[PDB]
Scaffold this motif. Structure first.
Motif, PDB file in Angstrom:
ATOM      1  N   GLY A   3       0.761  -1.216  -0.076  1.00 36.58           N
ATOM      2  CA  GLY A   3      -0.018   0.288  -0.018  1.00 36.58           C
ATOM      3  C   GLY A   3       0.889   1.531   0.085  1.00 36.58           C
ATOM      4  N   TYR A   4       0.699   2.045  -1.146  1.00 36.39           N
ATOM      5  CA  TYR A   4       1.329   3.226  -1.184  1.00 36.39           C
ATOM      6  C   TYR A   4       0.759   4.425  -1.525  1.00 36.39           C
ATOM      7  CZ  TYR A   4       5.672   0.080  -1.792  1.00 36.39           C
ATOM      8  OH  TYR A   4       6.554  -0.873  -1.384  1.00 36.39           O
ATOM      9  N   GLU A   5       0.789   5.621  -0.889  1.00 35.54           N
ATOM     10  CA  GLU A   5      -0.083   6.793  -0.928  1.00 35.54           C
ATOM     11  C   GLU A   5       0.954   7.635  -1.365  1.00 35.54           C
ATOM     12  OE1 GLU A   5      -3.839   7.120   1.096  1.00 35.54           O
ATOM     13  OE2 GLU A   5      -3.437   5.139   1.923  1.00 35.54           O
ATOM     14  N   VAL A   6       1.309   8.152  -2.393  1.00 35.36           N
ATOM     15  CA  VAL A   6       2.414   9.199  -2.478  1.00 35.36           C
ATOM     16  C   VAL A   6       1.730  10.326  -3.381  1.00 35.36           C
ATOM     17  CG1 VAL A   6       4.647   9.764  -3.426  1.00 35.36           C
ATOM     18  CG2 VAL A   6       4.416   7.332  -2.390  1.00 35.36           C
ATOM     19  N   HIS A   7       1.629  11.559  -2.872  1.00 31.40           N
ATOM     20  CA  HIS A   7       1.125  12.812  -3.705  1.00 31.40           C
ATOM     21  C   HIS A   7       1.445  13.908  -3.143  1.00 31.40           C
ATOM     22  CE1 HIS A   7      -1.921  12.762  -0.094  1.00 31.40           C
ATOM     23  NE2 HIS A   7      -1.554  11.496  -0.029  1.00 31.40           N
ATOM     24  N   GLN A  22       3.966  16.199  -4.541  1.00 29.93           N
ATOM     25  CA  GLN A  22       5.553  16.330  -4.353  1.00 29.93           C
ATOM     26  C   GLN A  22       6.083  17.230  -5.575  1.00 29.93           C
ATOM     27  OE1 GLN A  22       4.358  12.841  -3.919  1.00 29.93           O
ATOM     28  NE2 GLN A  22       5.361  12.679  -1.781  1.00 29.93           N
ATOM     29  N   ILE A  70      17.279   7.915 -10.177  1.00 27.18           N
ATOM     30  CA  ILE A  70      15.922   7.884 -10.152  1.00 27.18           C
ATOM     31  C   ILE A  70      15.539   9.324  -9.546  1.00 27.18           C
ATOM     32  CG2 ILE A  70      13.345   7.181 -10.106  1.00 27.18           C
ATOM     33  CD1 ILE A  70      15.495   4.561  -9.309  1.00 27.18           C
ATOM     34  N   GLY A  71      14.745  10.419 -10.049  1.00 22.28           N
ATOM     35  CA  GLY A  71      14.343  11.613  -9.532  1.00 22.28           C
ATOM     36  C   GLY A  71      13.404  11.297  -8.293  1.00 22.28           C
ATOM     37  N   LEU A  72      12.315  10.479  -8.462  1.00 30.92           N
ATOM     38  CA  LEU A  72      11.547  10.283  -7.560  1.00 30.92           C
ATOM     39  C   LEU A  72      10.870   8.687  -7.920  1.00 30.92           C
ATOM     40  CD1 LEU A  72       8.012  12.057  -6.814  1.00 30.92           C
ATOM     41  CD2 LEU A  72       8.463   9.701  -6.114  1.00 30.92           C
ATOM     42  N   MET A  73      11.178   7.821  -6.827  1.00 32.18           N
ATOM     43  CA  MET A  73      10.921   6.130  -7.053  1.00 32.18           C
ATOM     44  C   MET A  73       9.842   5.706  -6.273  1.00 32.18           C
ATOM     45  SD  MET A  73      12.071   3.207  -8.095  1.00 32.18           S
ATOM     46  CE  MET A  73      10.584   2.420  -7.768  1.00 32.18           C
ATOM     47  N   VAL A  74       9.154   5.161  -6.477  1.00 34.89           N
ATOM     48  CA  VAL A  74       7.941   4.664  -5.430  1.00 34.89           C
ATOM     49  C   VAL A  74       7.852   2.917  -5.899  1.00 34.89           C
ATOM     50  CG1 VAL A  74       5.691   4.422  -4.818  1.00 34.89           C
ATOM     51  CG2 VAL A  74       6.783   6.716  -5.365  1.00 34.89           C
ATOM     52  N   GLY A  75       8.348   2.151  -4.811  1.00 36.06           N
ATOM     53  CA  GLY A  75       8.377   1.008  -4.973  1.00 36.06           C
ATOM     54  C   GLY A  75       9.475   0.053  -4.276  1.00 36.06           C
ATOM     55  N   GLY A  76      10.286  -0.712  -5.272  1.00 32.41           N
ATOM     56  CA  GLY A  76      11.589  -1.346  -4.735  1.00 32.41           C
ATOM     57  C   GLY A  76      12.707  -1.250  -5.794  1.00 32.41           C
ATOM     58  N   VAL A  77      13.687  -0.988  -5.338  1.00 35.18           N
ATOM     59  CA  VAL A  77      15.149  -0.965  -6.265  1.00 35.18           C
ATOM     60  C   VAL A  77      15.805  -2.096  -5.766  1.00 35.18           C
ATOM     61  CG1 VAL A  77      17.164   0.125  -6.592  1.00 35.18           C
ATOM     62  CG2 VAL A  77      14.764   1.434  -6.812  1.00 35.18           C
TER      63      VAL A  77
END
Lengths: 34, 34, 34, 34, 34, 34, 34, 34, 34, 34, 34, 34
Positions: free
Chosen positions: A1-5, A7, A24-31
């Motif tokens: 569950g991700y809620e990114v807003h 920015q 990455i300038g903005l990364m949501v998840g996994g690296v």
């Protein structure tokens, strides 16, 4: 569950030679880097 | 579950030579580099 | 459960040569480097 | 459970050569380096 | 349970060579280095 | 339970060579180094 | 004599109501407000 | 004689109501306000 | 004679109401306010 | 004769109401307020 | 003759109401207030 | 003749109301207040 807003991101990159990873300038998840 | 919204992103890249990785301004999900 | 919002981020990068890791301005989630 | 909001972050990086780790301006979650 | 908000962070990094660890301006969560 | 807010942090780093640990301007949570 | 070059400017404006003056991202010359 | 070059400027403005003056991200020259 | 170069400026403005003066991120020259 | 270069400036402004003067992040030259 | 270079300045301003003077993060030259 | 370089300055200002003078983080030159 991700809620990114809501920015405001500024990314400056200068002289990026022979890049083999992740830039990455903005990364949501996994690296995963091996 | 991803909820990414309302992003104001500016990406500056200068002198990117021989890139072999990932250069993403805004990435949602997964990045795998081997 | 992630709730990330209202971020004003400025990233300055200069002289990034032979990068093999992760360079992220704003990262939400997980980073695994081996 | 993460609640991260209202961040004003400025990141200065200069002379980043042969990076193999993680360089994140703002990280929410987990970082595993082996 | 994390509640991190209203942060004004400035990070200066100069001469970062051969980095293998984690260099994070603002980290919320966990850091594991082996 | 963490409640961290209203922080004005300035971090100066100069001459960071061969870093293998964690260098965090502001860390909320746990740091494990082995 | 003006010599202005090589500028990377990002301007964020939010909630600009009833503006009667000058709001310029990058101004070269003269501004007269009476 | 003006020689202004190589500028990386980021301007954040929030809640600018009833502006009657000058709000310039980068100004080269002269500003006269009466 | 002005020689201004290589500037990395970040300007944060919040709650700017009824502005009648000059709010400049980077100013080169002269400012006259009466 | 002015020679201003290599500046890394971060300006935080919060709650700027009814401004009638000059608020400059970086000023090169002269400021006259009457 | 001015030679100003290599400055890392961070300016925090909070609760600036009814400003009539000069509030400059970094000033090179002359300031006249009457 | 001025030679000012390599300065790491942090300025904290809180509760600045009805300012009529000069509040400068770093000033090079002359300040005249009448």
């Amino acid at each position: 569950g991700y809620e990114v807003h809501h920015q405001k991101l500024v990314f400056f990159a200068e002289x990026v030679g022979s890049n083999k990873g992740a830039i990455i300038g903005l990364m949501v998840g996994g690296v995963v880097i091996a």
